[PDB]
Design a protein around this motif. Structure first.
Motif, mmCIF file in Angstrom:
data_model
loop_
_atom_site.group_PDB
_atom_site.id
_atom_site.type_symbol
_atom_site.label_atom_id
_atom_site.label_comp_id
_atom_site.label_asym_id
_atom_site.label_seq_id
_atom_site.Cartn_x
_atom_site.Cartn_y
_atom_site.Cartn_z
ATOM 1 N N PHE A 249 -5.751 -6.916 -7.153
ATOM 2 C CA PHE A 249 -5.163 -6.678 -5.762
ATOM 3 C C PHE A 249 -3.882 -6.902 -5.708
ATOM 4 O O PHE A 249 -3.019 -7.076 -6.837
ATOM 5 C CB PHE A 249 -5.569 -7.893 -4.610
ATOM 6 C CG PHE A 249 -5.223 -9.117 -4.529
ATOM 7 C CD1 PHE A 249 -3.794 -9.464 -4.600
ATOM 8 C CD2 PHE A 249 -6.239 -10.128 -5.144
ATOM 9 C CE1 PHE A 249 -3.526 -10.973 -4.729
ATOM 10 C CE2 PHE A 249 -5.951 -11.388 -5.375
ATOM 11 C CZ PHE A 249 -4.613 -11.984 -5.249
ATOM 12 N N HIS A 250 -3.015 -6.309 -4.667
ATOM 13 C CA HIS A 250 -1.638 -6.243 -4.713
ATOM 14 C C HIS A 250 -0.922 -5.970 -3.252
ATOM 15 O O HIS A 250 -2.043 -5.725 -2.347
ATOM 16 C CB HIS A 250 -1.120 -4.828 -5.734
ATOM 17 C CG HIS A 250 -1.582 -3.711 -4.985
ATOM 18 N ND1 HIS A 250 -2.705 -3.059 -5.433
ATOM 19 C CD2 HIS A 250 -1.058 -2.810 -4.164
ATOM 20 C CE1 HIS A 250 -3.086 -1.937 -4.766
ATOM 21 N NE2 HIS A 250 -1.892 -1.798 -4.019
ATOM 22 N N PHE A 251 0.370 -5.951 -3.212
ATOM 23 C CA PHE A 251 0.784 -5.799 -1.804
ATOM 24 C C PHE A 251 1.661 -4.755 -1.605
ATOM 25 O O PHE A 251 2.209 -4.242 -2.664
ATOM 26 C CB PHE A 251 1.411 -7.311 -1.332
ATOM 27 C CG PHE A 251 0.544 -8.401 -1.435
ATOM 28 C CD1 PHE A 251 0.300 -9.123 -2.752
ATOM 29 C CD2 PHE A 251 0.202 -9.000 -0.260
ATOM 30 C CE1 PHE A 251 -0.621 -10.243 -2.542
ATOM 31 C CE2 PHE A 251 -0.661 -10.281 -0.478
ATOM 32 C CZ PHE A 251 -0.919 -10.803 -1.569
ATOM 33 N N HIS A 252 2.073 -4.536 -0.195
ATOM 34 C CA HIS A 252 3.167 -3.683 -0.066
ATOM 35 C C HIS A 252 3.674 -4.473 0.963
ATOM 36 O O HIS A 252 3.227 -5.268 2.036
ATOM 37 C CB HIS A 252 2.606 -2.170 0.510
ATOM 38 C CG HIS A 252 1.969 -1.502 -0.487
ATOM 39 N ND1 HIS A 252 2.447 -0.510 -1.409
ATOM 40 C CD2 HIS A 252 0.415 -1.518 -0.798
ATOM 41 C CE1 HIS A 252 1.479 -0.147 -2.013
ATOM 42 N NE2 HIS A 252 0.372 -0.453 -1.467
ATOM 43 N N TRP A 253 5.251 -4.382 1.011
ATOM 44 C CA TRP A 253 5.976 -4.858 1.934
ATOM 45 C C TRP A 253 7.276 -3.946 2.260
ATOM 46 O O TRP A 253 7.424 -3.141 1.687
ATOM 47 C CB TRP A 253 6.384 -6.408 1.603
ATOM 48 C CG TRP A 253 7.043 -6.387 0.253
ATOM 49 C CD1 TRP A 253 8.465 -6.304 0.096
ATOM 50 C CD2 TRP A 253 6.722 -6.206 -1.007
ATOM 51 N NE1 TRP A 253 8.801 -6.236 -1.221
ATOM 52 C CE2 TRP A 253 7.735 -6.320 -2.131
ATOM 53 C CE3 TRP A 253 5.429 -6.486 -1.368
ATOM 54 C CZ2 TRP A 253 7.472 -6.455 -3.421
ATOM 55 C CZ3 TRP A 253 5.170 -6.516 -2.981
ATOM 56 C CH2 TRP A 253 6.159 -6.256 -3.896
ATOM 57 N N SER B 294 3.910 -2.880 6.477
ATOM 58 C CA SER B 294 2.456 -2.099 6.280
ATOM 59 C C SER B 294 2.321 -0.692 6.047
ATOM 60 O O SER B 294 3.214 0.086 6.458
ATOM 61 C CB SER B 294 1.637 -2.637 7.466
ATOM 62 O OG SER B 294 1.835 -2.048 8.852
ATOM 63 N N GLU B 295 1.456 -0.258 5.442
ATOM 64 C CA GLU B 295 1.009 1.145 4.848
ATOM 65 C C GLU B 295 0.248 1.705 6.299
ATOM 66 O O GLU B 295 0.689 2.623 6.813
ATOM 67 C CB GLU B 295 0.577 1.341 3.753
ATOM 68 C CG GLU B 295 1.392 1.031 2.502
ATOM 69 C CD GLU B 295 1.170 1.437 1.270
ATOM 70 O OE1 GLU B 295 0.012 1.621 0.868
ATOM 71 O OE2 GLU B 295 1.933 2.009 0.581
ATOM 72 N N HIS B 296 -1.024 1.337 6.462
ATOM 73 C CA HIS B 296 -1.628 1.645 7.587
ATOM 74 C C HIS B 296 -0.852 0.877 8.807
ATOM 75 O O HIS B 296 -0.095 -0.117 8.800
ATOM 76 C CB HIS B 296 -3.133 1.046 7.664
ATOM 77 C CG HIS B 296 -3.889 1.655 6.568
ATOM 78 N ND1 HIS B 296 -4.079 1.241 5.184
ATOM 79 C CD2 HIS B 296 -4.507 2.881 6.616
ATOM 80 C CE1 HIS B 296 -4.600 2.063 4.649
ATOM 81 N NE2 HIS B 296 -5.158 3.241 5.380
ATOM 82 N N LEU C 280 -2.188 -6.058 2.252
ATOM 83 C CA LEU C 280 -2.883 -6.296 0.885
ATOM 84 C C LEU C 280 -3.743 -5.415 0.569
ATOM 85 O O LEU C 280 -4.539 -4.987 1.548
ATOM 86 C CB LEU C 280 -3.390 -7.755 1.022
ATOM 87 C CG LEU C 280 -4.397 -8.361 0.156
ATOM 88 C CD1 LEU C 280 -4.215 -8.305 -1.436
ATOM 89 C CD2 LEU C 280 -5.065 -9.775 0.739
ATOM 90 N N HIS C 281 -3.821 -5.037 -0.473
ATOM 91 C CA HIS C 281 -4.878 -3.937 -1.007
ATOM 92 C C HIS C 281 -5.698 -4.783 -2.274
ATOM 93 O O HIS C 281 -5.239 -5.085 -3.172
ATOM 94 C CB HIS C 281 -4.323 -2.744 -1.712
ATOM 95 C CG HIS C 281 -3.728 -1.881 -0.554
ATOM 96 N ND1 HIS C 281 -2.738 -1.011 -0.731
ATOM 97 C CD2 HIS C 281 -4.008 -2.010 0.886
ATOM 98 C CE1 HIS C 281 -2.310 -0.397 0.582
ATOM 99 N NE2 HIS C 281 -3.174 -0.890 1.367
ATOM 100 N N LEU C 282 -6.891 -4.835 -1.844
ATOM 101 C CA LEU C 282 -8.195 -5.138 -2.923
ATOM 102 C C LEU C 282 -8.718 -4.073 -3.360
ATOM 103 O O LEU C 282 -9.407 -3.284 -2.603
ATOM 104 C CB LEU C 282 -8.965 -6.233 -2.266
ATOM 105 C CG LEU C 282 -8.410 -7.433 -1.808
ATOM 106 C CD1 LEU C 282 -8.528 -7.615 0.013
ATOM 107 C CD2 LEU C 282 -8.785 -8.784 -2.349
ATOM 108 N N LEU D 5 -5.680 6.865 -2.939
ATOM 109 C CA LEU D 5 -4.640 6.021 -3.401
ATOM 110 C C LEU D 5 -3.136 6.212 -2.824
ATOM 111 O O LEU D 5 -2.757 7.272 -2.369
ATOM 112 C CB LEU D 5 -4.329 5.977 -5.018
ATOM 113 C CG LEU D 5 -5.482 5.707 -5.837
ATOM 114 C CD1 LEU D 5 -5.098 6.000 -7.212
ATOM 115 C CD2 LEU D 5 -6.088 4.392 -5.666
ATOM 116 N N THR D 6 -2.471 5.261 -2.489
ATOM 117 C CA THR D 6 -1.034 5.309 -1.649
ATOM 118 C C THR D 6 0.032 5.455 -2.610
ATOM 119 O O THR D 6 1.129 5.435 -2.093
ATOM 120 C CB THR D 6 -1.166 4.059 -0.484
ATOM 121 O OG1 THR D 6 -0.782 2.890 -0.933
ATOM 122 C CG2 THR D 6 -2.171 4.179 0.548
ATOM 123 N N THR D 7 -0.132 5.284 -3.605
ATOM 124 C CA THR D 7 0.646 5.276 -4.854
ATOM 125 C C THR D 7 0.411 6.868 -5.651
ATOM 126 O O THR D 7 -0.849 6.763 -5.996
ATOM 127 C CB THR D 7 0.701 4.034 -5.730
ATOM 128 O OG1 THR D 7 -0.343 4.024 -6.299
ATOM 129 C CG2 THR D 7 1.540 2.994 -4.889
#
Ligand SMILES: [Zn+2]
Length: 257
Positions: A90-94, A102-104, A115-117, A194-196
């Motif tokens: 898992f990891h985060f975006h901020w 948040s991305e969404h 947080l993405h699991l 994927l968002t990356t």
């Protein structure tokens, strides 16, 4: 060469990753008035009892907490899914301030973090194989809403001092990924990517409706991370979110409504 600045950010990713302009890109804005019910949808089954965390790593784009996915240890089933998905990391975006990150988004509301699991379909044998398939990955997204300090989360943020720069890693055993989930598991779901980079369109997104908490003081810590390796000029990891992408032919479904 990709990142989140002025000249290497999401607007430019399409130059190296043309799929950035694809038809099933993530994240998206979740228009709640547009959400559809679907009787095929089930409750989420997060079977995380035997989850085995290994290490936390700064890869220059975010930091990941890695899980032993050698066996069926921490799995995700049911929800919108067919078959069994194994938790790998898992990891985060901020964002650079608390009002974004948040991305969404939900009716265009932005949370402080997300947080993405990340899970992969065991029918493909390994993550790499799963990653190139439409039904290959499943990512649970959890919003972090600024408010009360989060103990659990602190348990992650305390380790950030040990991985400040790109390529550093630290032992991180026995972390329960369920401790970062809300207690109600209502969700939105849609087919996405994927968002990356490489932005592969192989993700079944499951975005939880209920956020978890984080304090403003806690949010500061994410922003202490470095994009750069040690010995390189400092460039702080102030923000690492991709903005909402066109929903195009897709429909977001909700459970239980
Ligand atoms: Zn992510």
């Amino acid at each position: 060469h990709w990142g989140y600045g002025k000249h290497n950010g999401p607007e430019h990713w399409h130059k190296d990753f043309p799929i950035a302009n694809g038809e099933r890109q993530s994240p998206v804005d979740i228009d709640t008035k547009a959400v559809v019910q679907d009787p095929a949808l089930k409750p989420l089954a997060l079977v995380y009892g035997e989850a085995t965390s290994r290490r936390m790593v700064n890869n220059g784009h975010s930091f990941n907490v890695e899980y032993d996915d050698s066996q069926d240890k921490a799995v995700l089933k049911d929800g919108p899914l067919t078959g069994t998905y194994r938790l790998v990391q898992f990891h985060f975006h901020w964002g650079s301030s608390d009002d974004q990150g948040s991305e969404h988004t939900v009716d265009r509301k932005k949370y402080a973090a997300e947080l993405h699991l990340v899970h992969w379909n065991t029918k493909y044998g390994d993550f790499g194989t799963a990653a190139q398939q439409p039904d290959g990955l499943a990512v649970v997204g959890v919003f972090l809403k600024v408010g009360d300090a989060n103990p659990a989360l602190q348990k992650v943020l305390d380790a950030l001092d040990s991985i400040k720069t790109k390529g550093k890693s630290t032992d991180f055993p026995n972390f329960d990924p369920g401790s970062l989930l809300p207690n109600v598991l209502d969700y939105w779901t849609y087919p996405g990517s994927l968002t990356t980079p490489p932005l592969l369109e192989s993700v079944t997104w499951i975005v939880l409706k209920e956020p978890i908490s984080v304090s403003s003081q806690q949010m500061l810590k994410f922003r202490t991370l470095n994009f750069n390796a040690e010995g390189e000029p400092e460039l702080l990891m102030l923000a690492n979110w991709r903005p909402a992408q066109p929903l195009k032919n897709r429909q977001v479904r909700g459970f239980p409504k």
